[PDB]
Symmetry: C3
């Protein structure tokens, strides 16, 4: 009887950070309450100043990472303020029935809804908006995020021993399809209805104009670089709601990787690069062994370094010359 | 001595249905006899009325699913009627030697051939036409299907316990490359030889114009939606002979998935989405838990909802409010 | 203390051949010394005579396969002769720290450097040039190879029993992006700086003009076809530093496949086709069972047979009619 269960209210945080949680469940099953407010907003996505009309959960691209345990109930209050112009909904890949919730959560501007589902399968999962007839337009406008459903006894390695992270980040990767004119310059639009046919035409090229982490070129760099210390265990959750990606930590590895995100399966070990299919979340566990700057990319390097799918880690600590050293520094002889 | 084995004649059915078979082999090894007749035919592939010259096994795109057991012999009589114009052949990814049979099955119009091979490896496998010098043109004209080679003791889970399906469907996914003029409209052609250079040019874009299930936009919808009941175990075999896909059951999961189709490997559990590489068949097992309409898609949602890679299930039964419920229906407050 | 270890000098060979090594380590850990000389050179990559300015390690596309054992130290002397025009460096996906070595190996023309790293994880791994701000341009000019790090006790199957190859080949697959004019013809350039913006524009299409094995259309065919005998065990290492591929042995299988290349994981069995993500090396083990010609392809068949990603094996020995036979040869009746 769900009314006899504890309720716990979660207050979400902006990606790539993740709201506080316990790896190992410290209670029995709970109804875990979340609220998200849909926000249609202009976003500048590149260094050139290209501005799109983003469709967001909670103001961000991606939407925030939600975290529960297996056989908790997720109860989401989804708000679509009357400041928005479009109908929206939500499909959880973690959920069972009604198109993952999309059939039950259609909210016009000025409406709200509350959906509850049981998180019966452990893993990281995509969630995304999916309004009938307009699904890829919403998703590729940034209206997607992820949910992690931890096993109640936390993560385990390929032999059944615990894997405990010290830090977790969520990297949402977004393919955008900004319409172009015949000369190649990005077009802009005065209403969503006036944009729609050209959005469809741009999507049908299957060629993104931009592929970004955390909503913009360079978002996870500089003052917003990811951080870690030597010897810290870091879980990077990575989602792509629409298109394949191939994550890679430049200078590191995925020590344990669930490339298709589902924790009942043993992880793949020692990965250089892995394939997260479009429509999937994956998760990589790494223990840092060297300080300095790392890049974290989609290893189609064009997608990374020309189209935006690249972020950085700044790692503190001592350098290990046993693991790597310059024997003879670059010089002319 | 193969002449001392039983022979069994199979009569194929049109996808997405699958001819009758036993999961667990009820006989010893057999020579399993199949006949397919090649048919070149016009097909309308979209809602707009776009008509292509399809190249088919047995009249359908995809070709029918053939089913045998491990260490049976497949004996295929391949007929190319003199009503056809082209040379064709067949390559089984399940077979060993002679380019999978393609070197031994070259049939001009008005010829036939009979190939026999031993099905030594269990799995779902692509079969496709592959005439030297014209391979992607035949494949991307729809001239491909799949063959399932069941283990003699049926399917097993990741712990070695039986998995038995109640229903099986075969979803063939086809990338088409309909040539376009400079303005973007589809071109048509008076002979295959007059089409060939423009077919090659369209293919070399690597950008399909259409990506469809069972030969056409909307083929697995309406009166041809897939069906199941709550609690039924369903195996969906999915092939893509030329290009990657990423299947997803909207509202469900792949409870057990052989993403690259080979049953000696333990399945992946609880998948949201999985990657079937171009040139591969995969298979997903699911137990339905909720009634209603599901969509089954390639989760590049552009490929799904703009280019055609989407079908539906209609599922009967009782709704489980424990698994999902609307707590507060969409309303303004 | 690394100075107390044996040093062993390796003399590399041109792909697809692989320098001599022991599967099972016949010594303790060693410092394994390699030297590579960077060569910028013109290469003709297709049958039409299309000439690009390639950027190579040791004169070849791909660069040579390096082979060590787990917990050996790789010591690479990288030479950039003053006959070259560009700055280059090297990133090993096998290494830990400093962007895989790229931060420590920046060599202008007329410089050299020596990098040492510990090969702490067993697998096949990409190595590639990666100069800050110019990474995909160098990689997609051919400046990439692979390194195999064998377990000290050699390869093992999914049950822990030895897998020993008789022969090994390295197939480097290269996506090129030759700039095109408005009419579709390839452009040429008088200096690297004059080429750069058009190289970036061509890359941003995400549509390769050519996809080749061993540096050119048809490179692994004819007098340079791969060879084997019936009953020989063959390991094919396959890399793709920038873009996904889907290898397939036409007429065979991958009996044991590490699709993402890391030997601590059990291999996938009986694969028809597998996905090697861009930025990864994979490895397939097969025992040949039939003589004759095989094709080895990227099973996007357009990429294979139109864009160049296809090679051949010539296999000697006796034909097995139990495994495959023509029962009735193609004829009219
Ligand atoms: O290894 N850096 O792509
Ligand atoms: O979850 N529907 O793409
Ligand atoms: O099976 N040949 O693509
Ligand atoms: Cu929306
Ligand atoms: Cu979805
Ligand atoms: Cu054909
Ligand atoms: Cu094939
Ligand atoms: Cu370089
Ligand atoms: Cu790299």
């Amino acid at each position: 009887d769900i009314s006899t269960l504890p309720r716990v209210k979660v207050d979400l945080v902006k990606p790539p950070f993740v709201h506080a949680h316990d790896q190992v469940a410290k209670t029995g099953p709970r109804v875990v309450e979340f609220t998200m407010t849909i926000e249609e907003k202009k976003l500048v996505i590149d260094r050139e100043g290209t501005e799109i009309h983003a469709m967001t959960f909670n103001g961000s691209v991606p939407g925030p990472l939600m975290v529960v345990h297996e056989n908790d109930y997720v109860e989401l209050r989804l708000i679509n303020p009357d400041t928005n112009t479009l109908l929206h909904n939500i499909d959880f890949h973690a959920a069972t029935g009604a198109l993952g919730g999309g059939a039950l959560t259609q909210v016009n501007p000025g409406e709200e809804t509350t959906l509850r589902f049981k998180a019966t399968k452990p893993g990281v999962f995509v969630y995304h908006c999916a309004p009938e007839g307009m699904v890829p337009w919403h998703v590729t406008s940034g209206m997607n995020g992820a949910i992690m459903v931890l096993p109640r006894d936390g993560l385990k390695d390929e032999k059944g021993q615990p894997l405990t992270y010290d830090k977790i980040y969520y990297v949402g990767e977004q393919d955008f399809y900004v319409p172009k004119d015949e000369a190649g310059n990005y077009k802009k639009y005065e209403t969503p209805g006036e944009a729609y046919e050209d959005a469809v035409k741009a999507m049908r090229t299957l060629t993104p104009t931009h592929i970004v982490f955390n909503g913009a070129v360079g978002a996870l760099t500089g003052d917003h670089a990811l951080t870690a210390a030597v010897g810290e265990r870091v879980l990077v959750v990575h989602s792509q709601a629409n298109r394949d990606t191939r994550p890679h930590l430049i200078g590191g590895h995925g020590d344990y990787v669930w490339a298709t995100g589902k924790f009942r399966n043993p992880p793949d070990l020692d990965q250089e690069t892995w394939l997260i299919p479009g429509g999937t979340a994956g998760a990589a566990f790494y223990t840092f062994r060297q300080p300095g700057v790392y890049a974290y990319v989609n290893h189609n390097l064009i997608e990374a370094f020309e189209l935006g799918a690249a972020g950085h880690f700044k790692v503190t600590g001592e350098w290990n010359d046993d693991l790597m050293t310059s024997v003879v520094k670059p010089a002319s002889m």
